[PDB]
Design a protein around this ligand. Structure first.
Ligand SMILES: O=c1ccn([C@@H]2O[C@H](COP(=O)(O)OP(=O)(O)O)[C@@H](O)[C@H]2O)c(=O)[nH]1
Ligand SMILES: O=c1ccn([C@@H]2O[C@H](COP(=O)(O)OP(=O)(O)O)[C@@H](O)[C@H]2O)c(=O)[nH]1
Ligand SMILES: Nc1nc(Cl)nc2c1ncn2[C@H]1C[C@H](O)[C@@H](CO)O1
Ligand SMILES: Nc1nc(Cl)nc2c1ncn2[C@H]1C[C@H](O)[C@@H](CO)O1
Lengths: 220, 221
């Protein structure tokens, strides 16, 4: 049993940074990066198409994003205590991003219906293989994430308003901290969650965070 | 194992008519209709995405293709779970005609762009590679009708959302059928046996000869 751990967090919270750190630490730990390059060049920049015109492209983006993530995660499944760290999960795709888009009217009722039906189906076929043993929540304020967006400077992301990040933050908080967000996957209510404050730059100040992860993994 | 047979044909060629004749002819024969009622009122487990596509294909075609293909797959898979002796399952169209006739045409006509088309193909590959293995066809029956016959049959059935379909659209789909199933120029499918039936003549009360061709064809598989 490879233990499967999803790293969750708002845009530019520091997931890639954290996971690039973690993978360098044990031969028994592997990561699966979010398929961002694939979305940027399917130009066929569907990430950019969605940000530029979300009401036209959100549904299209959601379908490709989730599929590309599932493919990567399944592929990674093929050591002493192996751990697989996923950058986000099929659940954040649906219950954080897709849901917010529906709520903001970037997906209509039909698009949202078709999407949930698709996502339901995909998971009945592969829920079992990608069932998470734990979640690491990298928690950062919307303001922190907005600044880290500016820092990173992806051209597609520079139009993003603080209000968008807030909406996504509230979803993370409701799902992972308050545990009030209801999903269709009941086991997620009881999955162990490690919450890490990453408002401070941790690139060279990560010993405490890494200590917390090891302790958490040993309880699983 | 059930023999799986797709019934292929242009819009309003008479596939549902034909299949509803065949299902009455033996306990061993069952049919999987196209989920048109799911497309006309989008539900879950309401928007008319069929009408959405016809009214604005360049907005809704990709969305229609994913839903229609998933709904077809689901319907065909649920059909598998006929103790009959010589069991035959007749599919109203297949995942192949979804991709290689309909979606291909919409991309060729610029209703789907390069990104939509890439995404759809990637999606179709995976969906079929993961859930279609048990849906491989043992045979195809091609109900062949001219584009003109189809157009008048569209007008006869009188589906509201189909009334704007031009002859040229039917021609394009007709060519795709001919090329795939007759000329075999168009994707194991290169090898699947095909029965071609001419259905230009009304067959509602004159189908004995068609049915005899089908019985014989099935007896060769
Ligand atoms: O402790 C940190 C964490 C992140 N970053 C930067 O903040 C931006 C977003 O981080 P990352 O790509 O990891 O975020 P993700 O979107 O993967 O959550 C990138 O420029 C990082 O280099 C940083 O400077 N110090
Ligand atoms: O021999 C026939 C075959 C079909 N129809 C009519 O043609 C229309 C389209 O047939 P169907 O729905 O079966 O076509 P499909 O789209 O399923 O190919 C319907 O009004 C049928 O009643 C007919 O009058 N005589
Ligand atoms: N399901 C998703 N729906 C949307 Cl609209 N966006 C997403 C999704 N998953 C990742 N991103 C975005 C957030 C970042 O801008 C970028 C890399 O995480 O991709
Ligand atoms: N893959 C499909 N792509 C499109 Cl654009 N349309 C389809 C498809 N499959 C069936 N139909 C349409 C044709 C008829 O109008 C109706 C019932 O067959 O649905």
């Amino acid at each position: 049993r490879i233990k499967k751990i999803s790293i969750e967090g708002n845009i530019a919270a520091g997931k890639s940074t954290f996971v690039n750190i973690l993978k360098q630490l044990s031969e028994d730990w592997e990561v699966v990066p979010e398929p961002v390059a694939r979305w940027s060049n399917v130009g066929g920049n569907v990430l950019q198409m969605m940000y530029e015109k979300p009401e036209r492209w959100s549904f299209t983006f959601q379908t490709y994003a989730c599929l590309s993530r599932i493919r990567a995660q399944l592929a990674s499944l093929n050591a002493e205590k192996p751990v697989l760290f996923f950058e986000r999960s099929v659940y954040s795709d649906r219950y954080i991003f897709a849901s917010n888009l529906y709520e903001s009217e970037s997906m209509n009722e039909t698009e949202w219906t078709i999407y949930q039906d698709w996502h339901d189906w995909m998971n009945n076929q592969f829920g079992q293989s990608l069932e998470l043993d734990g979640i690491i929540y990298l928690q950062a304020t919307p303001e922190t994430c907005l600044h880290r967006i500016y820092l990173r400077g992806r051209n597609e992301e520079q139009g993003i308003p603080l209000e968008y990040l807030e909406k996504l933050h509230y979803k993370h908080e409701s799902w992972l901290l308050h545990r009030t967000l209801k999903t269709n996957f009941d086991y997620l209510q009881e999955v162990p969650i490690l919450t890490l404050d990453v408002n401070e730059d941790f690139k060279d100040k990560y010993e405490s965070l890494v200590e917390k992860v090891k302790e958490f993994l040993s309880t699983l």
